[PDB]
Structure 1
């Protein structure tokens, strides 16, 4: 039943990412309000720029974590559905690709891997037919509702901010920034 826990983790990651987005928007709007507020306040401007920088960095991190959780949910759902379906219809497709898997039996590692890859390309050529004709198909009815909640791939808002990559030094310094932000917010 770990699919439910994975779904809950994805949902709370999405909620946390939305919280990060709205607080980043609030920081940006107050910063732009202070831009026209005049009166220098150079130290305040610098600290607000640091705040918005760490906000956008943690927004990017939360978006990446949400994407990772979403793809983990997709993977676990796929593996569970395939496992139950194979327990339901194993023999039919086992006999469809019979000769390679029947000669598989017990062999050496290289021969076993060669048979496995032959089976993979055979089923690739099998699936290419419906990849070509491709009529519409929906989610599995057993657990569609959860798949309905996530729907398609994560939205562009969760991936448009993940284009850039940060070196480990950047990650370390921004983690220090987050730690000092938390320490100064606690007081």
Structure 2
């Protein structure tokens, strides 16, 4: 039943990412409003710059978390859907692959790897031709609702906001700065 946990984790990550996004947006609109004012407020200006940077880093982290959770839930859906499909048609699929993987357990590790490699690239051209027919298909009936709610692909905002990457030293220093800012805003 881990699919439900993955789905709710993905939903929570998406909600947190959206909260980071709109909080950051409010932050930069307030920063623009303050800089447009006559008052110099240099301390206010550079503390708002620091806030902008740290909130943008938090948005990047939340987007990365959401992408990873979406990939994890998609992987869980793929694995259990393939599990039930394999339970349903394993004997027939093996009979299709009988010239290749017959006596699989009675073989060494490297021979097993080579045999399954032949099986799977044969499956490669099989699926290539099947899709090259040109038909259109929908989601699996059992878990259609979850996969439709999470979507085929994540949001473009989640991918273009997370395209930038930080070195581990930057990650550590921004984590420290975010903790300091959280402590400051808590009090």
Q: CA deviation at 1:139?
A: 0.1
- For 2:134 and 2:150, how far apart are their aligned partners in 1? 23
Moved over 3 A (4+): none
The farther-off stretch of 99-108 and 122-131 is 99-108
Q: CA deviation at 1:116?
A: 1.1
- For 1:134 and 1:61, how far apart are their aligned partners in 2? 39
Q: How far does the alpha carbon of each residue in 1:154-181 deviate from its partner, in whole angstroms, 9 at most, with x for none?
A: 0101111111111011101100111101
Q: How many residues align?
A: 187
Q: How far does the alpha carbon of each residue in 1:83-113 deviate from its partner, in whole angstroms, 9 at most, with x for none?
A: 0111111111111111111142311111111
Q: CA deviation at 1:134?
A: 2.5
Q: CA deviation at 1:23?
A: 0.1
The farther-off stretch of 101-110 and 86-95 is 101-110
The farther-off stretch of 128-137 and 41-50 is 128-137
Q: How far does the alpha carbon of each residue in 1:45-86 deviate from its partner, in whole angstroms, 9 at most, with x for none?
A: 000000010000000000000000000000001001110111
The two structures, once aligned, show a CA RMSD in angstroms of 0.9
- For 1:58 and 1:124, how far apart are their aligned partners in 2? 40
TM-score (norm 1): 0.97
Matched, 1:174 2:174: yes
Counterpart secondary structure, 1:139: coil
Structure 2 runs not aligned, ≥5 long: none
- For 2:159 and 2:27, how far apart are their aligned partners in 1? 21
- For 2:126 and 2:152, how far apart are their aligned partners in 1? 25
Q: CA deviation at 1:9?
A: 0.1
TM-score (norm 2): 0.97
Counterpart secondary structure, 1:77: helix
